Ligand binder design. Sequence first.
Ligand SMILES: O=c1ccn([C@@H]2O[C@H](COP(=O)(O)OP(=O)(O)O[C@H]3OC[C@@H](O)[C@H](O)[C@H]3O)[C@@H](O)[C@H]2O)c(=O)[nH]1
Ligand SMILES: O=c1ccn([C@@H]2O[C@H](COP(=O)(O)OP(=O)(O)O[C@H]3OC[C@@H](O)[C@H](O)[C@H]3O)[C@@H](O)[C@H]2O)c(=O)[nH]1
Ligand SMILES: O=c1ccn([C@@H]2O[C@H](COP(=O)(O)OP(=O)(O)O[C@H]3OC[C@@H](O)[C@H](O)[C@H]3O)[C@@H](O)[C@H]2O)c(=O)[nH]1
Ligand SMILES: O=c1ccn([C@@H]2O[C@H](COP(=O)(O)OP(=O)(O)O[C@H]3OC[C@@H](O)[C@H](O)[C@H]3O)[C@@H](O)[C@H]2O)c(=O)[nH]1
Lengths: 460, 459, 132
Amino acid sequence: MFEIKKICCIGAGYVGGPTCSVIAHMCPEIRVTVVDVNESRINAWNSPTLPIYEPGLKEVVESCRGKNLFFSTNIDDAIKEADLVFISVNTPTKTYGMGKGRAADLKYIEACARRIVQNSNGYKIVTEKSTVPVRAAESIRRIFDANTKPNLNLQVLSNPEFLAEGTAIKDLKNPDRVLIGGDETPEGQRAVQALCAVYEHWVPREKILTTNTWSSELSKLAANAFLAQRISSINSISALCEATGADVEEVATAIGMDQRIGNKFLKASVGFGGSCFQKDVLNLVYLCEALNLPEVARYWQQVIDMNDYQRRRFASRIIDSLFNTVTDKKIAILGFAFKKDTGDTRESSSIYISKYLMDEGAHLHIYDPKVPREQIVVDLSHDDQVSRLVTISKDPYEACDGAHAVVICTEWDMFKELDYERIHKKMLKPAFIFDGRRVLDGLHNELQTIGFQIETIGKK
Amino acid sequence: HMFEIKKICCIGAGYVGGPTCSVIAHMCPEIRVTVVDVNESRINAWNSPTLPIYEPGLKEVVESCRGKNLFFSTNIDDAIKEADLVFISVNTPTKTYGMGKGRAADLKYIEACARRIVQNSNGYKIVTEKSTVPVRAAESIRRIFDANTKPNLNLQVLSNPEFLAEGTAIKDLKNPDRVLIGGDETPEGQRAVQALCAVYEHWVPREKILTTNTWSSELSKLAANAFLAQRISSINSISALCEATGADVEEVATAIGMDQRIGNKFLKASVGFGGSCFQKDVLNLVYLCEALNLPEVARYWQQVIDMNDYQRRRFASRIIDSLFNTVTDKKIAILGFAFKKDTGDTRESSSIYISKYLMDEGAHLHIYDPKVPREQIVVDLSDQVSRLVTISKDPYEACDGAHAVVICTEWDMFKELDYERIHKKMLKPAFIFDGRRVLDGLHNELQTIGFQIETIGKK
Amino acid sequence: KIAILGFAFKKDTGDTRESSSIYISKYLMDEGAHLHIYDPKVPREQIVVDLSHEDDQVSRLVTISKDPYEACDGAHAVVICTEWDMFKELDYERIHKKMLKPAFIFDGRRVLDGLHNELQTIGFQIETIGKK
Ligand SMILES: O=c1ccn([C@@H]2O[C@H](COP(=O)(O)OP(=O)(O)O[C@H]3OC[C@@H](O)[C@H](O)[C@H]3O)[C@@H](O)[C@H]2O)c(=O)[nH]1
Ligand SMILES: O=c1ccn([C@@H]2O[C@H](COP(=O)(O)OP(=O)(O)O[C@H]3OC[C@@H](O)[C@H](O)[C@H]3O)[C@@H](O)[C@H]2O)c(=O)[nH]1
Ligand SMILES: O=c1ccn([C@@H]2O[C@H](COP(=O)(O)OP(=O)(O)O[C@H]3OC[C@@H](O)[C@H](O)[C@H]3O)[C@@H](O)[C@H]2O)c(=O)[nH]1
Ligand SMILES: O=c1ccn([C@@H]2O[C@H](COP(=O)(O)OP(=O)(O)O[C@H]3OC[C@@H](O)[C@H](O)[C@H]3O)[C@@H](O)[C@H]2O)c(=O)[nH]1
């Protein structure tokens, strides 16, 4: 019955931007307007240099922008004319009060809901889309139910986003599934069906799951936690491998060939990062404690404790290899993004490894091909310690020049292609490589012949 | 220089040794396979029309080979003496006293097999440990062999963990996802590994055979089992969250499992996992990690067992609460005692733990299972058994006059029972506690009939 | 089977009060070991009392040997807990022949120092306090 012809998305971030760009790309007859309070971000979306790095994103944006894809700071008018309003904003962790450091702060979701009511008349579908929805649909409904107008009829859906950064475009174009939650009422099902009709322009119907809003959000919270758990599980095995002379990459191969386990997300690492996994597990633990499910809470907390231990163990292996004094020693940090093919650093293990070494007085020279220099400075600041200890290098050979150790924290493909003979000539000896990503496997013989001490996760 | 296996001896005619060697003999008609055991009644059963374990398709495999190239015997000594390859597939029970009591595996039968092999061997032989939970097994065998040499005796030790699941053993053995063989990284070890590979290549493609050293083989099995158990505990933890918030764990599991990085297998919430593999495996992994001064890894994997124990306790207390916290002299039917469907095996079955929680409340249990022998149920539950436990010959007898029906094992026959007939003769309110989600889709009919239906992961 | 050589709390006495041999024996009894205990001066009955809580665990697990070769016959391990001088003069080639293999000597007193090369050549695994 109802056809979505105009879409407004509040939030032009890693979720809203790529998601709306793909919708516009696949649905040429739908006008898609992405809005944001951040004017410089909107200006960048409208420029030759997009505000985030995603493979393939520039091509998608440029094929649609100004045709049926628009980026604007005019939030009010985009809402007023929209058939469907996405809310894709950030929900930062509370920094004080109950749940400090653990529970999500819904203040931006609620501010979006109030702004939608202020600027809406008639019928609209309002859809919360995030990687970590924490009571998001309920809080929007809470606002809408309390702020009615004659003839205003807002429907609330949940539509979690499953994309992973660095593969956003491919993930959005061929999702494993689309998940839409709405009320089990006639109006709720009419709204769900309208959103299904958008996705059916490019997603087969059998890959679209529909449920209620709570089941949708819980499914996302749980699915994220299962993924994070696979990593902590293989990372726990990596510590066991180091202690017993086995190789975690070989053990992972044997594990993953069980088709009931599957062979994905078994790559041991210095530790998982990103704005999703830690926040998701912390909020799951907090929700469980609030529901008086302490056994479930402490079950999932281990996913975070293991990740924290993995990072700490890696840093202390570095410090031990430098014989427990790192004062005034130059150390190259190769990779600051939380994974390859993004400039995003949120919860990157590189931040934590860098801070552990700064606490030892190391002089870090940090190189990453896509993370902006100013972002690294902010991430490592509480300021004076950053001023004394942190240098941001424009190329990796400068970062390694005169270094005692090279620490690979992000699996950028270019790192396996470096001229390690040149790097060794200008390092102080003994020269260490700490591969926190297993990207140098198979170069171990060459690197040892050159003269490096190579240490990697899950192998001793 | 190589070695061709023409005669195989398997010490241990259990759920691992019997089916595995039967499939080997079936797939390798030119290899003589002799399964041996200290247990004479078990050997007699393997040689009879009624096998000592229930595995779908096993009788047909055994009867196609037995007496041609497959033999079952109590003559352990002669089987070893003539063997090219000796499998050790015995049980390693958990220690009941001393260091690691209740947690660490007891290697005494492995060590006795190793000593018996030296005694009865001359010349060259390959000795392969094959179990679902190998815990320092290859190392303990090597230690015995290194210390007990003879002129011209040359024993090689391999690890070859068994990945089969009971109830699907024959299909699993005929089409394994992978075969894992560990051997020494020496010329002798590689010759032994290749010999065992050649056996499996009669029916397993070479790209599915992984070769490594013995410790990496055992650690890979210990970890793989724990990953499987962890999936179950993870979805069971979500089932409690679903019950508390109005969601349905089966729908949540479907949404989770459609992520191809997670996969859609082993996401079936339940009263809790059982079997001789998973709990033993995680306990031994935790104990090993503690011994290696890895307490963070130990407490990480311990949560898999703690969650399973909580899932069982929570299910039992729902039953007791639904019966308003007094079950003294109340008849309760237990449908399913095996640890999963299509086996008669009860080792660590959740049905044991649920039954004991109800017995501690004074319930009169009537237990029905289509394949578990009556005497095993009596042993598993052991005066309190005499007072409280009845073994029913059919499920209608167990439910006659019952307050509650508790489904603990997902036997397919339970979804086809005459539940209108069951309701007529139960006391009211009549409860069904579906600990396996086997009655999904009958919920409307059962409510119309008049049952109170409670199931895991839904409220 | 495990041989316990030495039960007195030090050499040249029959006194067992708070002897380490009691505690080591009890740790091994908790593991189900069959202890065969030899000491040249401690009375048989004192060992029985020291290892009891008429004790059924003592009945099942403890044998008091009249000489050290009987204690070691068929043993997996020889545990020296008291530094009696006679222990370094034993015929360890004869002991090794009748032990099960691998045959361990756990020297809790360092009394076999300097015999280590001879004992390893014979074929023992020798473990001692304060050394690998
Ligand atoms: O009220 C607001 C709040 C926020 N915003 C904008 O919303 C955008 C959010 O983009 P971000 O890059 O910060 O966040 P993401 O797109 O990656 O969201 C993701 O990470 C943050 C998590 O809390 C979310 O669960 C996840 O979906 C920002 O550009 C911000 O300026 C608004 O326009 N209005
Ligand atoms: O095997 C692995 C996989 C991933 N990782 C690490 O885990 C972290 C997360 O990586 P992902 O590929 O999942 O990327 P993202 O965090 O952007 O996406 C994740 O959260 C958002 C959800 O919508 C996605 O479905 C989920 O994949 C990264 O730090 C990555 O390097 C490993 O260390 N090992
Ligand atoms: O010294 C021995 C010990 C045991 N055995 C026999 O070995 C056989 C083992 O069979 P079981 O049915 O008990 O055990 P499984 O075949 O199922 O082994 C499986 O579960 C037990 C666990 O300890 C193992 O890790 C697992 O592989 C028994 O029939 C037993 O009589 C011997 O012949 N000699
Ligand atoms: O989704 C699931 C799957 C399994 N289970 C339960 O988990 C327990 C184990 O079931 P399995 O099918 O794995 O059966 P098994 O214990 O025989 O095999 C397991 O251990 C031995 C290994 O070699 C096998 O690879 C492994 O699957 C059973 O109690 C089963 O009912 C669930 O509760 N949910």
